Amino acid sequence: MMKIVVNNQSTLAAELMIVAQENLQKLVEQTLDRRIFKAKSGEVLPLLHGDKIVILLGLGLRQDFIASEYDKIIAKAAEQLKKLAIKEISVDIDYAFENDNVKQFTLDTVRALISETYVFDQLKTEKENYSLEQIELVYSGDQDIEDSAKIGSAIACGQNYAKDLQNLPANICTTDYMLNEARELTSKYATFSLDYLDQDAMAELGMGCALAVGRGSYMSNYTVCMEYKGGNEGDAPIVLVGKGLVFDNGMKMDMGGVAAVMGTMKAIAMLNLPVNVVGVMGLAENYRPGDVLKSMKGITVEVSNTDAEGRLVLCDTLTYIGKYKPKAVIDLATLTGAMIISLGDAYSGMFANSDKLANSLEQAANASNDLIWRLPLHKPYLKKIESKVADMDNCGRDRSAGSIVAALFLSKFTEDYEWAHLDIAGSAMGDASCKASGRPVPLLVHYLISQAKENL
Amino acid sequence: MMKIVVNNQSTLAAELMIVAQENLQKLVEQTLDRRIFKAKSGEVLPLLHGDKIVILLGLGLRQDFIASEYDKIIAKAAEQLKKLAIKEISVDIDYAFENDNVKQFTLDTVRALISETYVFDQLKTEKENYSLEQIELVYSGDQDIEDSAKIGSAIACGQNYAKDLQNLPANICTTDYMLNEARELTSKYATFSLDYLDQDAMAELGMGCALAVGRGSYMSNYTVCMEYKGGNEGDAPIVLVGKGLVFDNGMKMDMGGVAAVMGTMKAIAMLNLPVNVVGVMGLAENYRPGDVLKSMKGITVEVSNTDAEGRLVLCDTLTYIGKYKPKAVIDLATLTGAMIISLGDAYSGMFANSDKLANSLEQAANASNDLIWRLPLHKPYLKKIESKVADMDNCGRDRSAGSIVAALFLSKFTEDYEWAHLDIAGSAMGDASCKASGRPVPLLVHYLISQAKENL
Amino acid sequence: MMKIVVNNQSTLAAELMIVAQENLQKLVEQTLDRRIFKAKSGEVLPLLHGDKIVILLGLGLRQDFIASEYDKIIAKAAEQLKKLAIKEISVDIDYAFENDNVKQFTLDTVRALISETYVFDQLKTEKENYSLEQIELVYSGDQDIEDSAKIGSAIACGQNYAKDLQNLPANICTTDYMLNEARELTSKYATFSLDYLDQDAMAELGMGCALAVGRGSYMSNYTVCMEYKGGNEGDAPIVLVGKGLVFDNGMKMDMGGVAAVMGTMKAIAMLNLPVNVVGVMGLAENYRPGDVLKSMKGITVEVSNTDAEGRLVLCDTLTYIGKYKPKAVIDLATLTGAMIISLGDAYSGMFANSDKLANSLEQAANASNDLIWRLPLHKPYLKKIESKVADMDNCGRDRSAGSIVAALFLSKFTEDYEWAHLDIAGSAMGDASCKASGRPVPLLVHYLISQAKENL
Numbered sequence A, B, C: 001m002m003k004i005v006v007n008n009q010s011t012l013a014a015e016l017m018i019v020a021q022e023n024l025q026k027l028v029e030q031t032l033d034r035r036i037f038k039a040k041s042g043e044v045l046p047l048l049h050g051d052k053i054v055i056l057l058g059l060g061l062r063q064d065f066i067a068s069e070y071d072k073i074i075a076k077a078a079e080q081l082k083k084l085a086i087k088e089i090s091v092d093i094d095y096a097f098e099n100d101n102v103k104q105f106t107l108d109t110v111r112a113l114i115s116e117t118y119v120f121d122q123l124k125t126e127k128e129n130y131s132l133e134q135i136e137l138v139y140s141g142d143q144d145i146e147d148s149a150k151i152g153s154a155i156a157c158g159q160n161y162a163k164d165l166q167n168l169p170a171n172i173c174t175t176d177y178m179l180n181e182a183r184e185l186t187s188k189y190a191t192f193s194l195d196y197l198d199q200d201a202m203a204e205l206g207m208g209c210a211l212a213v214g215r216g217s218y219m220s221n222y223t224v225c226m227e228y229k230g231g232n233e234g235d236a237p238i239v240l241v242g243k244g245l246v247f248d249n250g251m252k253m254d255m256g257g258v259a260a261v262m263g264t265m266k267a268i269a270m271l272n273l274p275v276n277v278v279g280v281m282g283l284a285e286n287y288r289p290g291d292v293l294k295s296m297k298g299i300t301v302e303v304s305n306t307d308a309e310g311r312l313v314l315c316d317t318l319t320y321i322g323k324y325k326p327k328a329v330i331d332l333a334t335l336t337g338a339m340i341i342s343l344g345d346a347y348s349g350m351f352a353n354s355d356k357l358a359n360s361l362e363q364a365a366n367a368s369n370d371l372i373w374r375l376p377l378h379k380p381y382l383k384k385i386e387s388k389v390a391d392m393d394n395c396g397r398d399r400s401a402g403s404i405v406a407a408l409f410l411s412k413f414t415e416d417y418e419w420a421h422l423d424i425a426g427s428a429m430g431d432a433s434c435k436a437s438g439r440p441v442p443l444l445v446h447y448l449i450s451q452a453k454e455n456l
């Protein structure tokens, strides 16, 4: 596997010097060796002069530094690593910002490095044969950063797993494929258990909304539950709900919901978090316009928009998970294109029926720099999905407050939970980058770690 | 004019009873007179039984009550008022919610009544000949509500004026027409003064962005400044900047920016606020794709989107107002259609480069229930308007984070102010209601009143 | 200015080693210094180890090498040059392909280097302040390459000038601006003379097609002629005709036609070619659908497509240039979007009414690797522009054989010349690269040089 260690000097054959612009001069003294690299944000200079390779990466000035953009900077170094085929790297952070707290910066540096050196060649004939085998984090200060490195490593491992699942094509990534992934993941840890419903079970429960979305398909619906019993027995679990509609459209809406749940379950299992968590996945493949379905809850839904099938899967799943008597429920869905227009790729939009939960997610977002922006769950917009023939419509007649309307639809099914909804259409896919990001795995693991600490 | 008085009993020939559902029974005792009206939110029952007419209007239960929707409820009564031709009305609020603070509820009731009985028949041959001549607010409690009524009245007067200006057609509402409105408004109050630039003056200042938007038109550009010297001489003014691009398109983007500035200037003049305020209006009428302009600031702007001309007018105006050395600058623009998708009609989206200012606007929004939602001014999205041939583009190449991008463009021109930008495309026009609302006049007057009090 | 010299060893402080993969080993012996760079096509490795910087640039294997793509490879080195701020560079070509003839490779290397280090910051506030000041071409063989370097230099100077003109925005690049460029260029060389027609002159000649295209605009039409009298007096000139419709649309059709004429006139003036050449520019700015115009030739043209105005300018200009009694006439026009669909960015599509001329252009294209593909001037497609009300239509009723139809339209005006038409919509702009290329300046200068040699 990947070796992550921490040390107070650099001992590998290649080194990556991460340099704040205000520390450039000091670095120069310790070393126009002087003039050539100015340590500007994202600037990269590989010095192959010594027998050992040295790559300088600039951060610019503290006052211009947006932490949420740090992956984009590390990306620059990661290209050089791949290009020079460097598999073992010492990462010296002594010349970064004095102000920044080292623990989070360590966590982030390790995470971004492992994340940005990710490669997908599963379906290619020519293999890249490149990956990092070792990172030696080099730090001279007095702070304990060992664990931070371990966590950033685990998270990056989960983001990359999420990326794998988002990158698979729909004909390979079938509902059976996903069900098998859940089996293979749960088999690897004694703390895991797997429960799931097939169509028959789902039909006995009256899950009319979710079953209708797959009605026409050859791929079976499944509601898959990975119970991670990290915490004390009987303590209420945190439930993560992911939407995994194969071949979903809004432009294409990928597996990001379930991909991030998988990625998050893997990470917390690796870190062995002392918290109870259930990862739940609603699986289906893509029932005419105007049909009326009966949800498990018993609310009748007129499906006015055939494009909006993803929410139908999420509503029955959200009703079903109530059995867990969850302390919190967070769902993740590449749910609306409106989200990209509202916030772009940088933020996951979030909606919550609980200020306490919203706050915790906001703290996790600040800590991890996996950015969220809360949007208002504005009840009067419920009128936009009144229906002539049914209890409610699934979608408004126009595009206005689209994401809000979608969250409101779901909110009819979650009134008994403390609940948050992350619309990750932008944050998971990009907005024209079109690249799997593995988000919001980092946010969720920070949130879960914070909840796990509150346990002790 | 309109008579607003306050009294502890009802003495006019028609009465409007505003009834919380929890107080229905109590109202019945004081009076199937019983069974017929249930005081549901917005329910209306006119009793023409007595010689005096009595209209009952329900509020539903406290726990279901969204204050920001109160105009929609009052609207129901206002239809009855017009239909029954009632010009003098006693408004009894003793049966409304006990919990609600009476002062704000009084202010809101008076405002909504005057606002919702608004009529526009200026260009019609058949006149409605309807308006409220007198409201007697009836309240039995110990709170002093006289002033609250006066304020709600002034605000509604400003909203209606704003509605008039939004409702005028572009061929009547010329830049000259607007300039004359500013003259007529400033002539009515000793506290007002008028300064303005014509094209020649604007060209001497190098206002290349704003001048370019009107370059082709017969209607002249103007930058119109209404200085309201309510406060102590030499105290830094609050500057309100409005975008008034005649015949603007994004669907059509109306005069809402300048209309709300006008409405706000009228209201604070009527209330005689002890605060220094300058209302500024950038006027122009609708220069090919790809042109490069030099702003007054000297930044060069490639105009990639011919639709996005409104921001060009706002940037030069924002630079120009710096002369005032304003304590705060708030601009208002029906700027993007993206806003309607993000938030719909209920919220003005806001962006701020100052947390202090954002907070004050958030307090005003809470107080008045003229809702705002802060969106993030996310600097990395500046990349979306990098330009090959110029300092910057005016618009991104796609629709993503559109409103944010527009705010970021403007933010390049306001780095020296505490500054907020209200995108009122949704809140001023509706999202398919398509009706002038006079917003955000109510928000701005609350904000200004709060600032005026902090003066003493 | 730029210093270009030739030498048999490298004497500047930075060096660029251009390395064929089959010569990598040999280079290594002369020098894992070994393992790291594999000389793959476009691979770049800057060695800042010595006091002098050394950049290695790979070509891959001879059998995989497409010469027309060489600029894309040089581009890789040019980024490093700019990034390391290297202004003086020795370019060693001894390790390139043995098979390639050195003269053309020298010409191409110099041209691509100067072309790919081009910067446009005319309208920017922040200047790049970067350009090559000196290239020392290093070659150990027995071939005389001095002149080749001079020519490649002149051509790159013309391509960059063309790029400048394509990159200017329409509001800066007015018909007056272009007329002034022709004045400034003709003033710099005794061999140049300037004749031109304004609108009045054009109207006396009956140029009804060209005048109609600008009829509505403020920018005047001009037909601008730069007579370059390099050759013997009285010898028939080669006429290059360029279409320069400001703000033209098809997506946007730029100044590429006149830009390349300008660039070509500059280059041959610098090289002092002993050939008679007239560069002619039809200038206008953007007359309803269905109008009938009388061309100078007297053919009546129904303008069915308002988008197709560019050809109307070209037809009157083509008639007019007959006065020169030209030996050959080549026109260049970003004329159809169809071209990009047919051939993409790599080829200029060409049409000719003369096999002799087509052949010469094909030889120039082979020599310079400024690629052309001849398309058929298929007379039966003349039926697609038959007109009910006029001699002919300007455009077909559908998109089929669009470029061919456009060439056929023009061919009605050139039956007395040996004539070629280059549709450079793809080759000048890119197809989503969207980048000015300065093509086909290189092709035209090779053609002209070849014609100049045939003179002696």
Ligand SMILES: [Cl-]
Binding pocket: A114, A156, A157, A160, A161
């Ligand atoms: Cl990994």
Ligand SMILES: [Cl-]
Binding pocket: A307, A308, A309, A310, A311, A335, A336
């Ligand atoms: Cl959906």
Ligand SMILES: [Cl-]
Binding pocket: A336, A337, A338, A399, A402, A403
């Ligand atoms: Cl939507």
Ligand SMILES: [Cl-]
Binding pocket: A415, A416, A417, A418
């Ligand atoms: Cl609850």
Ligand SMILES: [Cl-]
Binding pocket: A273, A274, A449, A452, A453
């Ligand atoms: Cl923990």
Ligand SMILES: [Cl-]
Binding pocket: B114, B156, B157, B160, B161
């Ligand atoms: Cl009024």
Ligand SMILES: [Cl-]
Binding pocket: B307, B308, B309, B310, B311, B335, B336
């Ligand atoms: Cl705009």
Ligand SMILES: [Cl-]
Binding pocket: B336, B337, B338, B399, B402, B403
């Ligand atoms: Cl937009």
Ligand SMILES: [Cl-]
Binding pocket: B415, B416, B417, B418
């Ligand atoms: Cl400030």
Ligand SMILES: [Cl-]
Binding pocket: B273, B274, B449, B452, B453
């Ligand atoms: Cl006050």
Ligand SMILES: [Cl-]
Binding pocket: C114, C156, C157, C160, C161
């Ligand atoms: Cl040059």
Ligand SMILES: [Cl-]
Binding pocket: C307, C308, C309, C310, C311, C335, C336
């Ligand atoms: Cl054309």
Ligand SMILES: [Cl-]
Binding pocket: C336, C337, C338, C399, C402, C403
């Ligand atoms: Cl075509």
Ligand SMILES: [Cl-]
Binding pocket: C415, C416, C417, C418
């Ligand atoms: Cl001939």
Ligand SMILES: [Cl-]
Binding pocket: C273, C274, C449, C452, C453
């Ligand atoms: Cl020659």
Ligand SMILES: [K+]
Binding pocket: A186, A187, A188, A189, A190, A191, A192, A193
């Ligand atoms: K297990």
